[PDB]
Each structure stands twice: as structure tokens, then as C-alpha cells.
Amino acid sequence: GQQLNRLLLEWIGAWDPFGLGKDAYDVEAASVLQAVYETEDARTLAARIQSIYEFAFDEPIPFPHCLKLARRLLELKQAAS
Q1: CA–CA separation, 70 vs 1, rounded Å?
Q2: CA nearest 70: which of 12, 25, 30?
Q3: Domain 1-81 CATH class label
């Protein structure tokens, strides 16, 4: 279904690293969702997250912050597959 994807998108928006509200990140959430399907590795995903958000905001989010998110997303992906 798309149930898993909607949940992943919700989590990514909710991450809200810059205190802009969950709705400010639809573009970046879609991009992170794509990356989620391209790996099973939290490090790899975290680096994609970092690049996506650095492009979007001209600010590098600390890698370990990206890594927690990547781990959470892959935990959900794995729990559903």
C-alpha cells in the first residue's frame, strides 16, 4: 500500500530540524523517501538526508542528528518488510 510511505513522510516532516512546522518540508520529505528505498544502511541514508537538507536550507545538519533519523526510518521500513 501507501500506508507505510505516508507514515515515513509524516515522520520526516515531523523531524522539523529548523522549527518551521511539519508542513514546511514536503519536497525534502519526498526526497528522503526516495533515498529510503535505495538503501538498508543507516550511514548511507543519513548522508543522503544531510545533503538533501543542506541543499534546501544552506545549512549542514550535524551528521549524528541525520543518523538518528535514518535509523528510525529504516526501523520502520524493516518492521513493515
Answers
A1: 21
A2: 12
A3: mainly alpha
